Design a protein around this ligand. Structure first.
Ligand SMILES: [Zn+2]
Lengths: 326, 107, 287, 145, 118
C-alpha cells in the first residue's frame, strides 16, 4: 500500500522525515519481502550528504533481512569501516539487530576492528552490538573470552575512555546480566512468525540515541526461554526430560567471589530454566516418564501435558506467598 | 532439498544481484568524495606562507624545522611530499598557520 | 533547580553577518548583537544580527550605547522585526576564541535579563578558508561548583562538541566557562536560491558563451598544453625506461613515493577535453 | 520470497486436507493462521472445539494464538468467541473464559522467574566503582533494570 | 522415471552453471568491494589528514630538551629562550625513559613529550 507514500516522502526536503521514510518502510516491509527498498536504503546511505539518514539507513535493512543471519554481515562488511563514523555506527546497529539472538560469528569476528577506533560512536555501538549477540552463549561452543575481557576492561578503563563510551559500555554490560541469564530476546516466534512488540522494543530501543529514556522500552522485547508442560490450569506436575549432551556445557558463567551426558535434565515442576534453541533437538523425554502429552514434544514451546495413568497421585505442589511480588 | 535447492538458491541469486548496482553507487560516489577531500586538502595549501629552514629528519614522515626566528619546531610533514625534500640543509617552506611544507625552494 | 539540553539554531543570515563582520574583524575589538526568539527552554533560534561601531575602549558595557541600541531596535520594530536580543557576540582575533574578564563581566551583566544569553566568537583570522569553525560559548553558575558541573541531558551531540579540542584553550580554560552545540537550518528557497545562485556563480549567462572559446583554445592555446603534457608524459617515460630493470631485480618492497600512474590518468583526463569539445564543435557547426 | 498473491490461497486450500484426515494437526493451522490471518480460517476451528468436545487439544493452539501472530485479529477473535457459548454450558464457559486470559503465562513467568534469579555483587559493586553522578548514573540503574 | 535424474537433472546442471554465473557475480562483487575498501581507506586516510589539520592549526610543535629530570614527575625541560617550562609530559609515556641531557619532541602549548630524539 504505502509505496507511493514512502517514495513520495523520500523526496522530502526534510532530513528528519527522510529518515522517517526509512524507519517507516521497515515495518511495512519486514520479512525480506522486498528486494526493492534495499536499493534506495543503500542508495540514500551512500548518496545523501546528511548522515542522519545514513546512520538511520541500514536498520530497516536488518528489519527486513532478519530471516537470514548469514547474508547480512557480508553485505554490511564494507560498512563496518565506512567513510564517516555514522555509517560505522549505524552498521553497528545493523550487526546488532541482524545477529541478535543468534550464534553467527560473522558479526563477532568483525567486532575486533570495531572495538578500537578514535571515534567514541563506533566504540560505543561496538559494545552495544557486542552485547546483543553474546547473550545466551556458552564458551565451550564458541570462543568468546576476547569480547568478555574487552567488555570487562572498559569499566576499569573508564578513567581514560570517553564519558559517552563508558555509558554504552556498562549499559552494554547489563545486557548479558539481563534477567540473571534466564530471559533473552527473539526477533521471531517458534512458528517463524515475528513478534510486533519485539520489533517495537528493538527499534525504539535504537532510538535511545536522540532521547535516552526511550531505552527503557527494551523490556517489551524480553522473551524468556523455557518450556510449558502445564496439564491443567491449576494443577502443576513435575516433568523431567533429559538432554543428550553434557550438563556442564550449558551452565551459567558463575563469576568471581569478590567479598558425557546428563542422566536427566534439570528443568522440573512444570521451573524450566533457560534453553538454547539448539538444545531443542537434544531434549529427550523419558520412556519411563509417567505422564506424556498427546502432541510429541519435538521443539521447545508451549504444550500441555496429558495424564497417561489417569489415577491418583497427580503430585500437586503449592504456590509461593507474599513478598517482592504479590 | 534437491528440487528446493533451485528456488531456495534463486533468492541468493537475487541477493547477490542487488549488490551490483549498490557497488556501482559506492564506486561512483566515493571517488567523487575522494576528489572532494582531495581538492579540500589541496585548498588548504595556500601560497602566502612563512619560510623556515630544515635541520634534521629524526624519523620517517616527521621531522624538525628551524624557523626563521631560530627556534626549532617539530612538525609532522605532509605525506604527499617524497624523500627528496628531506635534504638536511634545504630551503624548506612551511605554512604561515598550518606550518606544514608545500615545497622547498632552489638555492 | 533545573538545567536542560539546549542547541543553537544558526541561519545563514546571522552567519554572513558574522562573516561581513569577520571581514570587519580587523585587529580591533568589534561589537554586535544577536536577535531572535526563544520558543522554549531547550531550543534557541537566531535570525537578526547586526554590527556596532567601534570605540577605542573596545568591547565593554560602556561600549553599548543603550539609546542607540534601543533606537535601532525600535527602528527594527517599525519594520518587520519584532524580535528581542538573544545574545551578544564579538571577535577575538589571534589570541584564541576564549573570553576575557571584561568579556565574562559584561556577559555577567548582560545575562541578567536573558537567562540563556548566548555568546559567540568569530575568528577568521587564524581560521583557514577550508573550515569556518565557530563556537557559541556559555557561562556556568558559580554556585553550581558543589554539584556536578553541567547537568545537560542527551549526551549524543557531545561527540560532535569535542571538535573544539585545542590543548590549551578549551580544557585549558573550560572551568567556569563552557560551550554549546551549533546546528543550522536551510529551507528550500535558501537551498535552491543559494544553490542555483552558486551554480550560476560557476556557470555563464546564456551559458553557451565560454564553450566555443575553449573549444577553439584547444586549437590556439591548449595545443601548447598538449605538447607540454606530452613533455611531462615522455619526461616520466624516461624514468619508467629504467624501472623494468629494478622490477627485473628486486620486486620486494616499495621505496618510491612517486607513482607515475594517476598523474598520467589526470593528463589523459585533461587531454579528453579535446574529445568532449570536438562534439561541442559538432553541435555548433550543426546548428 | 512470495508476493502473497497466490501463497495465502495455496495455504487456505492446503488446510482443507487435514480436516478431511482422521485428525486435525496444529502445526499447519498455526503456520497458515500466522500468514493468511483470516477470520474465516479461524471461525471454523474455534467452533470445532465444541464439536470435538476435547479440552486438552484446544489449549496448545489457543496458547500460542494468544501468544503470537496477531493483536487486532486476536481482539476480533476474542469477541467472536464472546458470541460463542452461553449469553456443555458449564464446561465450555470455563474453557472460553480461561483460554482468553493469557495471564497464566504471566503467573508462571512470575513463579519460575521468581525462583531462578542470579545476581552478583561483582557487577553491581563494579558499577558503584564506576558510577559518576551525571552520565553513567542512569547506566547503572538501566543495568539494574 | 528419468526426469529428476535427467530433465530436472540437466535443469539442475543449468542451475550449477547459474552458480558459475553467481561465481562471476560473486567474484566481481569481491574485487569491486576490495577496490571499494581501498578507496574507503584512502579517502579515509586523507580524512585523517584533516584530523591532523588541527595539529596543523597548532602552528606545529616545539623542540624540548630535558637537561634534568625531576623526581616529582614534573620534568624541568630547557626550552628556546623565555622557556624553561617545567611540566608533566603525557601519561602514555613514562618519565624514567626520558633521559636527561637529550633532545625530545614537545608540543608547543600542552608541553607533552612525543619521543626521544638524536
Ligand atoms: Zn584583545
Amino acid at each position: 500500500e504505502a509505496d507511493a507514500l514512502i517514495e513520495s516522502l523520500c523526496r522530502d526536503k526534510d532530513p528528519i522525515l527522510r529518515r522517517s521514510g526509512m524507519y517507516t518502510v521497515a515495518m511495512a516491509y519486514c520479512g525480506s519481502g522486498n528486494n526493492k527498498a534495499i536499493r534506495r536504503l543503500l542508495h540514500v546511505a551512500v548518496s545523501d550528504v546528511n548522515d542522519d539518514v545514513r546512520r538511520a539507513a541500514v536498520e530497516s535493512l536488518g528489519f527486513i533481512l532478519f530471516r537470514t543471519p548469514e547474508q547480512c554481515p557480508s553485505v554490511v562488511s564494507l560498512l563496518s569501516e565506512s567513510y564517516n563514523p555514522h555509517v560505522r555506527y549505524g552498521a553497528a546497529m545493523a550487526l546488532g539487530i541482524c545477529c541478535a539472538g543468534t550464534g553467527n560469528k560473522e558479526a563477532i569476528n568483525l567486532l575486533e576492528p570495531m572495538t578500537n577506533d578514535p571515534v567514541n560512536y563506533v566504540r560505543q555501538g561496538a559494545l552495544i552490538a557486542s552485547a546483543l549477540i553474546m547473550i545466551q552463549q556458552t564458551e565451550i561452543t564458541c570462543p568468546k573470552v576476547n569480547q568478555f575481557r574487552q567488555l570487562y576492561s572498559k569499566v576499569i578503563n573508564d578513567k581514560h575512555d570517553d564519558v559517552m563510551a563508558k555509558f554504552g559500555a556498562i549499559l552494554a554490560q547489563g545486557i548479558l546480566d539481563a534477567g540473571g541469564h534466564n530471559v533473552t530476546i527473539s526477533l521471531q516466534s517458534r512458528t517463524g512468525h515475528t513478534h510486533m512488540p519485539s520489533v517495537v522494543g528493538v527499534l525504539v530501543f535504537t532510538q535511545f540515541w536522540f532521547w535516552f529514556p526511550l531505552s527503557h522500552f527494551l523490556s517489551l522485547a524480553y522473551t524468556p526461554t523455557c518450556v510449558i508442560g502445564l496439564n491443567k490450569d491449576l494443577k502443576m506436575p513435575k516433568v523431567q526430560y533429559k538432554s543428550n549432551c553434557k550438563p556442564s556445557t550449558f551452565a551459567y558463567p558463575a563469576p568471581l567471589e569478590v567479598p558425557s551426558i546428563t542422566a536427566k535434565a534439570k528443568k522440573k515442576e512444570k521451573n524450566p530454566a533457560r534453553v538454547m534453541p539448539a538444545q531443542l533437538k537434544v531434549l529427550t523425554m523419558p520412556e519411563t516418564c509417567r505422564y506424556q502429552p498427546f502432541k510429541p514434544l519435538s521443539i521447545g514451546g508451549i504444550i500441555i501435558l496429558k495424564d497417561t495413568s489417569e489415577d491418583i497421585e497427580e503430585l500437586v505442589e503449592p504456590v509461593a506467598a507474599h513478598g517482592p511480588k504479590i | 532439498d534437491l528440487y528446493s535447492r533451485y528456488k531456495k538458491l534463486q533468492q541468493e541469486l537475487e541477493f547477490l544481484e542487488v549488490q551490483e548496482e549498490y557497488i556501482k553507487d559506492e564506486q561512483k560516489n566515493l571517488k567523487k568524495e575522494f576528489l572532494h577531500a582531495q581538492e579540500e586538502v589541496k585548498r588548504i595549501q595556500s601560497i602566502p606562507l612563512v619560510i623556515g629552514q630544515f635541520l634534521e629528519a629524526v624519523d620517517q614522515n616527521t621531522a624538525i624545522v628551524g624557523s626563521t626566528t631560530g627556534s626549532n619546531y617539530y612538525v609532522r610533514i605532509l605525506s604527499t611530499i617524497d624523500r627528496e625534500l628531506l635534504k638536511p640543509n634545504a630551503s624548506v617552506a612551511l605554512h604561515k598557520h598550518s606550518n606544514a611544507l608545500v615545497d622547498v625552494l632552489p638555492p | 533547580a533545573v538545567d536542560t539540553a539546549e542547541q543553537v539554531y544558526i541561519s545563514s543570515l546571522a552567519l554572513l553577518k558574522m562573516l561581513k563582520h569577520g571581514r570587519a574583524g580587523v585587529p580591533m575589538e568589534v561589537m554586535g548583537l544577536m536577535l531572535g526568539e526563544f520558543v522554549d527552554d531547550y531550543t534557541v533560534r537566531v535570525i537578526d544580527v547586526f554590527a556596532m561601531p567601534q570605540s577605542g575602549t573596545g568591547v565593554s558595557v560602556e561600549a553599548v550605547d543603550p539609546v542607540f541600541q534601543a533606537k535601532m531596535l525600535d527602528m527594527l520594530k517599525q519594520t518587520g522585526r519584532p524580535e528581542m536580543v538573544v545574545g551578544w557576540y564579538h571577535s577575538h582575533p589571534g589570541f584564541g576564541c576564549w573570553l576575557s574578564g571584561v568579556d565574562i563581566n559584561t556577559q555577567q551583566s548582560f545575562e541578567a535579563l536573558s537567562e540563556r544569553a548566548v555568546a559567540v566568537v568569530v575568528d577568521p583570522i587564524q581560521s583557514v578558508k577550508g573550515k569556518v569553525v565557530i563556537d557559541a560559548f556559555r557561562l556556568i553558575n558559580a554556585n553550581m561548583m558543589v554539584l556536578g558541573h553541567e547537568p545537560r541531558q542527551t549526551t549524543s551531540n557531545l561527540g560532535h562538541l569535542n571538535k573544539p579540542s585545542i590543548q590549551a584553550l578549551i580544557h585549558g580554560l573550560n572551568r567556569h566557562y563552557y560551550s554549546i552545540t551549533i546546528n543550522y537550518r536551510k529551507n528550500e528557497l535558501e537551498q535552491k536560491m543559494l544553490l542555483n545562485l552558486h551554480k550560476k556563480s560557476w556557470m555563464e549567462g546564456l551559458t553557451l558563451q565560454d564553450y566555443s572559446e575553449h573549444c577553439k583554445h584547444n586549437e590556439s592555446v591548449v595545443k601548447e598544453m598538449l605538447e607540454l603534457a606530452k613533455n611531462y608524459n615522455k619526461a616520466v617515460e624516461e624514468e619508467d625506461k629504467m624501472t623494468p630493470e629494478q622490477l627485473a631485480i628486486k620486486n620486494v618492497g616499495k621505496q618510491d613515493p612517486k607513482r607515475h600512474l594517476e598523474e598520467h590518468v589526470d593528463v589523459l583526463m585533461t587531454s579528453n577535453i579535446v574529445q568532449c569539445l570536438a562534439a561541442m564543435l559538432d553541435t555548433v557547426v550543426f546548428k | 520470497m512470495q508476493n502473497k498473491q497466490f501463497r495465502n490461497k495455496v495455504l487456505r486450500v492446503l488446510v482443507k486436507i487435514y480436516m478431511n484426515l482422521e485428525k486435525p494437526d496444529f502445526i499447519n493451522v498455526c503456520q497458515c493462521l500466522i500468514f493468511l490471518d483470516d477470520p474465516q480460517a479461524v471461525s471454523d476451528i474455534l467452533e470445532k472445539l465444541v464439536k470435538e468436545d476435547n479440552l486438552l487439544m484446544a489449549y496448545q493452539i489457543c496458547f500460542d494464538l494468544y501468544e503470537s501472530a496477531s493483536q487486532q485479529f486476536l481482539s476480533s477473535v476474542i469477541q467472536n468467541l464472546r458470541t460463542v457459548g452461553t449469553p456443555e454450558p458449564k464446561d465450555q464457559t470455563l474453557k472460553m473464559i480461561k483460554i482468553l486470559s493469557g495471564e497464566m503465562a504471566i503467573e508462571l513467568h512470575l513463579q519460575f522467574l521468581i525462583r531462578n534469579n542470579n545476581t552478583d555483587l561483582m557487577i553491581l559493586k563494579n558499577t558503584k566503582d564506576a558510577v559518576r553522578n551525571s552520565v553513567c548514573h542512569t547506566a547503572t540503574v538501566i543495568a539494574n533494570s | 522415471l528419468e526426469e529428476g535424474k535427467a530433465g530436472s537433472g540437466l535443469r539442475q546442471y543449468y542451475l550449477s552453471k547459474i552458480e558459475e554465473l553467481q561465481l562471476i557475480v560473486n567474484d566481481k562483487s569481491q574485487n569491486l568491494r576490495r577496490l571499494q575498501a581501498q578507496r574507503n581507506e584512502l579517502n579515509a586516510k586523507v580524512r585523517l589528514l584533516r584530523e591532523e589539520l588541527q595539529l596543523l592549526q597548532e602552528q606545529g610543535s616545539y623542540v624540548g630538551e630535558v637537561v634534568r629530570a625531576m623526581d616529582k614527575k614534573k620534568v624541568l625541560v630547557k626550552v628556546h629562550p623565555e622557556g624553561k617550562f617545567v611540566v608533566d609530559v603525557d601519561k602514555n609515556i613514562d618519565i624514567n625513559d626520558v633521559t636527561p641531557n637529550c633532545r625530545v619532541a614537545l608540543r608547543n602549548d600542552s608541553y607533552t613529550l612525543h619521543k626521544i630524539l638524536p
